[PDB]
Amino acid sequence: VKKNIESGIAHIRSTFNNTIVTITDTHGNAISWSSAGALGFRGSRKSTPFAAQMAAETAAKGSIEHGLKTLEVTVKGPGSGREAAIRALQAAGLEVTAIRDVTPVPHNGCRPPKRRRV
C-alpha cells in the first residue's frame, strides 16, 4: 500500500532564526520533514549548525523507513546551517544525487521594510 519511492528530493530552508528540512519525491510530494523547533530547540539555537544537523538527521532517519535510497538536494536561504545540514544528510547514509541552481533572487520586487535602528 505504501508507495516505495526509490529516490526523491529534499528542500531545506535555512534562516537566521529557524531551519526547515523537507524531503519530497520526484513530483514534490511531501515524504518527511523536520525542523529545529521539532528537535526541541526553542530559542535562537534553532538556526545553529548543530540544530540544522539534528533536523537533517531526523528527516533522513524518518525517510529511511519510507524507503527512498537516494535523494537530491535543493537547499535554499541564508544561514550557516546549510553546511551541517548537508553534512548530516551525507553521514546518514542516504547518498545525494544532484543539485539545482534555484534561488529566490528577485530582479526588483517590492521594497523591504525599515531597518532595525531607526
Binding site: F41, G43, R45, T48, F50, A51
Partner: protein, 151 residues
C-alpha cells in the same frame, strides 16, 4: 602569558599512588598534612577491613565513577547568559573528582572523617553516591546545553 608547570610527591607506603598523594595534599587544613595522612591511612584500613579487597582498586573505581566527562561553562553573549559544554582534560577531571569526593565526604556527617571518607569511597565505587549526584547534575546540564557543543 601562558600555562605553568608543577609537581607533587608520589611515594606513599599505604596504597602507593600519585592520585592518593594528590588527595593527601587535598583535605589538608591549617598546614597539617600529618592529620590528612593519618585520616587517609585509617580510612583505607577500614575499607580493607570491611571489604575483603585492596583499597587501591576501590579508589580507582570511585574516581572513574565520579570523574566528570563534560563541564558546563557559563558565557554571557548578550542578555541571555548562555552556557557552553566543555571537554574536561584528565587533569581537571581528576581534580574535580578529588574536590567532590572531599567536599561531599565532609558534608555527609558522621562521628569521624575517617568513617565519612570510607563510606564515601564505598558509595562512589557503587555509583549511587553523593559525589555521583553532582556528577549526574553536571552531565544533565551538559546534555541540556548540547546546543552549544561548539561556538
Amino acid at each position: 602569558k601562558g600555562p605553568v608547570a608543577k609537581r607533587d610527591v608520589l611515594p606513599d607506603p599505604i596504597y602507593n599512588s600519585k592520585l592518593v598523594s594528590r588527595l593527601i595534599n587535598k583535605m589538608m587544613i591549617d598546614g597539617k598534612k600529618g592529620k590528612s595522612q593519618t585520616i587517609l591511612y585509617k580510612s583505607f584500613d577500614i575499607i580493607k577491613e570491611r571489604t575483603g579487597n585492596d583499597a587501591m582498586e576501590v579508589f580507582e573505581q570511585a574516581l572513574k565513577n565520579i570523574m566528570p566527562v563534560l563541564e558546563v561553562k557559563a558565557r554571557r553573549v548578550g542578555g541571555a547568559n548562555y552556557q557552553v559544554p566543555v571537554e574536561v582534560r584528565p587533569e581537571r577531571r581528576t581534580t574535580l573528582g578529588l574536590r567532590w569526593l572531599v567536599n561531599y565526604a565532609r558534608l555527609r556527617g558522621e562521628k569521624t572523617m575517617e568513617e565519612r571518607l570510607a563510606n564515601e569511597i564505598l558509595d562512589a565505587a557503587n555509583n549511587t553516591g553523593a559525589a555521583v549526584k553532582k556528577r549526574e547534575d553536571t552531565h544533565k546540564m551538559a546534555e541540556a546545553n548540547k546546543a552549544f557543543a561548539h561556538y
